[PDB]
């Protein structure tokens, strides 16, 4: 040993660091990373909110105080979107006076407003109960509009209170416009999970998706209400088709061949109320089944989505979820844990040259 | 219509000064030929993909970042680990080592550039600063000095930050796609930045205005570095092509590609005299081109996964290559 005293001490420090790295890096393999994917307005932020409510610490009243401004931006954004869709669908107002109220909303600075008082409250209320505005809400099929618009404009009076505090449901149904990867860890029966949510990042996916080569599974949220909306606010494009394209792109990535796919079909309730008015056959010709049934629609959508799998070397766990009400998202979480355990099983069997 | 005319006049003026090519004027020089480099040291300890490394200015210390969520500072001469920094975000794509050695940087999918002080009286490495304000992931960062750092993001924008206040001193907008790499001039009065629009830009740090724009790649420019005089810089794209751009000529000079190379470059770096351009590739290799002729292709074939980062010391005495198989090799 030609080393001096100080270099022997340096070797000692390097070995200490070796041990610390080994410890931390074996902790970093007990935690399973689930990459949460899907299209916009599919129900994945509400998904993380729900499991935070039922597996994290929940939202304290300080968080609700932080969320209230976002709630008011949501109410203004939905009202403005309906107002704009009125002037693009070529439908006039039944009441002329409320038109002026509509103007009062058209110039609002959505990103800047933090107070919600009169006459804005009265203007919004007088707009919403217009027969023309109700017709526009009924025909919201042809334009982008948050699904929680009915829920907020039928509790306007509650949210217009000077002492209004958002409830758990209000927290669920509000956009938090944060950009960047969000990691959220979990304890499912002494198993550490972590949902990695992207999609708040508007950058190109190909440049940071290989970073998720080491994910246990991909939780792909498709919305069952995406049919019967070929938005006319832009070029005529179905939303189911966008979801299918994204699903194919995800399940053809070489990064994700080691990771299973859990497909969650969401907004099933809204499918139930859409079936009573609109049927699949008008937009998907390959469909052939009952017109006013919902289970047939659900299984058609699932069969259509699971057959995008190019190969027989990847199984797709699937679920019918409604990521707004609890005690159904608990079922979704149990299904996630079970599917991830099965994925780990199959990976170990493949490594042991058994499966 | 005036924009098209300005692009038209630039192109016709662009072709005027391209009387010859770098290949024609280099037919009278002796090739270095095969260069056999050896793994003098294999630095082990990273447990996941290595995404960036940066040499120290003493040519001996070395910081490297992995998706294991950790930076490691290595004494490259003795394979000793000098520091181990656990990161708050494990989705790190870049790291930097300060010229004075007091500081390290990192950043990634959190859109935040974290600066860590290395010379503390408390004996550990503390997070000196967290620079936030980018709306996309950070792909590269480079200390101008202990006080200022430039960060490139997927915002299509770069940002020169004053660290001691944490605010963007200047912003560099103008790219169309995500900015992926970044290189500082030797005097650090300029930098060069390539983005996912196949074009790079030469940016003025002081005045904050884009001086120059270089086009010619066919895909994302995900690797960029300066020739040691600061008058030239070599890009690496997904086209399986590296390319040399000289700032004075305002053109492209020589390409670095081959018929059997189909995968994109992850990293580029020059040799101390600029006679060697080492280029890390997605075929698990790390080529070594004679930067003056483009026909050397020495191979540092020691990695079993994609070579994601490489670098040459400030005395050109070695070259470190880190790859996706979590190993750093020091070739001399």
């Amino acid at each position: 040993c030609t080393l001096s005293a100080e270099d022997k001490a340096a070797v000692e420090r390097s070995k200490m660091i070796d041990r610390n790295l080994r410890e931390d890096g074996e902790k970093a393999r007990r935690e399973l990373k689930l990459l949460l994917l899907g299209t916009g307005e599919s129900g994945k932020s509400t998904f993380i909110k729900q499991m935070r409510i039922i597996h994290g610490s929940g939202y304290s009243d300080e968080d609700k105080r932080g969320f209230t401004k976002l709630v008011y931006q949501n109410i203004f954004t939905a009202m403005q979107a309906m107002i704009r869709a009125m002037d693009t669908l070529k439908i006039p107002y039944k009441y002329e006076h409320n038109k002026a109220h509509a103007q009062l909303v058209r110039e609002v600075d959505v990103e800047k407003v933090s107070a919600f008082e009169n006459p804005y409250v009265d203007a919004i209320k007088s707009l919403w109960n217009d027969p023309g505005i109700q017709e526009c809400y009924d025909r919201r099929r042809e334009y982008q509009l948050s699904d929680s618009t009915k829920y907020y404009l039928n509790d306007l009076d509650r949210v217009a209170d000077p002492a209004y505090l958002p409830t758990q449901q209000d927290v669920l149904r509000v956009r938090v416009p944060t950009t960047g990867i969000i990691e959220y860890p979990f304890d499912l029966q002494s198993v550490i999970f972590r949902m990695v949510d992207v999609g708040g990042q508007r950058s190109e996916r190909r440049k940071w998706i290989h970073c998720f080569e080491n994910v246990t599974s991909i939780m792909f949220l498709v919305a069952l209400s995406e049919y019967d909306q070929v938005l006319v606010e832009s070029d005529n494009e179905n939303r189911m088709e966008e979801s299918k394209a994204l699903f194919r792109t995800i399940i053809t990535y070489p990064w994700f061949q080691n990771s299973s796919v859990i497909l969650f079909l969401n907004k099933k309730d809204l499918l139930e109320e859409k079936i009573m008015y609109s049927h699949l056959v008008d937009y998907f010709p390959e469909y052939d089944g009952p017109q006013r049934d919902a289970q047939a629609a659900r299984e058609f959508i699932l069969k259509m989505f699971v057959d995008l799998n190019p190969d027989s070397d990847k199984i797709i766990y699937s679920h019918f979820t409604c990521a707004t009400d609890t005690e159904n998202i608990r079922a979704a979480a149990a299904f996630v844990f079970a599917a991830v355990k099965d994925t780990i099983l199959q990976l170990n069997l493949k490594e042991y040259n058994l499966v | 219509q005036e924009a098209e005319q300005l692009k038209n006049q630039i192109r016709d003026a662009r072709k005027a000064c391209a009387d010859a090519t770098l290949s024609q004027i280099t037919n009278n020089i002796d090739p270095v030929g095969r260069i056999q480099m050896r793994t003098r040291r294999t630095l082990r300890g990273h447990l996941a993909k290595i995404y960036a490394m940066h040499w120290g200015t003493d040519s001996r210390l070395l910081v490297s970042a992995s998706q294991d969520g950790k930076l490691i500072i290595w004494d490259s001469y003795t394979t000793n680990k000098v520091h181990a920094i656990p990161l708050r975000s494990s989705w790190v794509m870049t790291c930097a080592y300060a010229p004075s050695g007091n500081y390290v940087a990192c950043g990634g999918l959190d859109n935040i550039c974290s600066i860590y002080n290395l010379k503390t009286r408390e004996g550990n490495v503390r997070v000196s600063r967290e620079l936030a304000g980018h709306t996309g992931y950070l792909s590269c960062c480079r200390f101008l000095d202990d006080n200022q750092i430039v960060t490139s993001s997927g915002d299509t924008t770069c940002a020169l930050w004053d660290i001691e206040t944490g605010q963007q001193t200047t912003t560099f907008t103008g790219h169309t796609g995500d900015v992926m790499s970044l290189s500082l001039a030797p005097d650090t009065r300029l930098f060069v930045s390539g983005a996912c629009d196949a074009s790079a830009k030469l940016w003025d740090v002081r005045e904050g205005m884009c001086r120059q724009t270089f086009t010619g790649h066919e895909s994302d420019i995900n690797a960029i570095c300066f020739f040691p005089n600061g008058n030239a810089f070599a890009t690496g794209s997904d086209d399986a092509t590296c390319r040399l751009f000289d700032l004075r000529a305002d053109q492209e000079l020589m390409t670095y590609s081959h018929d059997n190379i189909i995968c994109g470059i992850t990293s580029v770096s020059f040799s101390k005299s600029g006679r060697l351009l080492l280029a890390g590739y997605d075929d698990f290799n790390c080529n070594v081109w004679d930067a003056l002729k483009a026909d050397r292709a020495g191979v540092l074939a020691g990695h079993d996964n994609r070579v994601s980062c490489l670098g040459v010391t400030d005395d050109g005495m070695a070259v470190a290559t880190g790859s996706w198989d979590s190993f750093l090799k020091i070739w001399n």
Epitope: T2, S4, A5, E6, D7, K8, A9, A10, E12, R13, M16 | R60, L61, D75, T78, N80, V82, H83, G101, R121, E122, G123, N124
Partner: single-chain antibody, 231 residues
Amino acid sequence: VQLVESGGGLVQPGGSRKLSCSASGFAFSSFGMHWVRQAPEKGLEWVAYISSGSGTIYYADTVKGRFTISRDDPKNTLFLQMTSLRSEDTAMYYCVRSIYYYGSSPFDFWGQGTTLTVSSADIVMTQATSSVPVTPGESVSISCRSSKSLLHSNGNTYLYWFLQRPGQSPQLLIYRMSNLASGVPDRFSGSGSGTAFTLTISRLEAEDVGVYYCMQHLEYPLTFGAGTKLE
């Protein structure tokens, strides 16, 4: 960044004493610790060393087996257990913080020590003279010698120059024969050849008086010289 020693006092002939050191304000679990003597009318003298991680322990050939160094990282308390105290054990005992990576400045921060009053192959470091008369504002230079060459074949030279001001604990000035410790004015420098070392002070100010010490760290034990008293 603070080290407090405790446990010193008057001990009966023989006997035993446990001296503690509480570290506060730094990462004491990432630091090696030394115990360093100093007689009431003599220079310093190294006692012991414990490593970062408790891996290795070193004693001097005048206390070995009769001492015991130890540490407790959760409570950041270093210990020297001391047994069978002969007359030659009456000294101030200082706890020295010392880290070792590439670039570290060992012996940078010392504690305040604590008095304890009891009722040849080693490198020999040797001062030139006991004192040097000087004048404020002048330039001063002391010298020191080593039996071996402290230039290790790795390029380092493990000479250390320390300052102990009257009524104060020591303070690293020069680490590894040339490098100025943090907080030391740039007025100091150290240079020489193997087995011949000189410490130079330019623009000699007040409170720069004291005793300057030349220690070596090339091997254990760590050997001091008498140290020149700049007065």
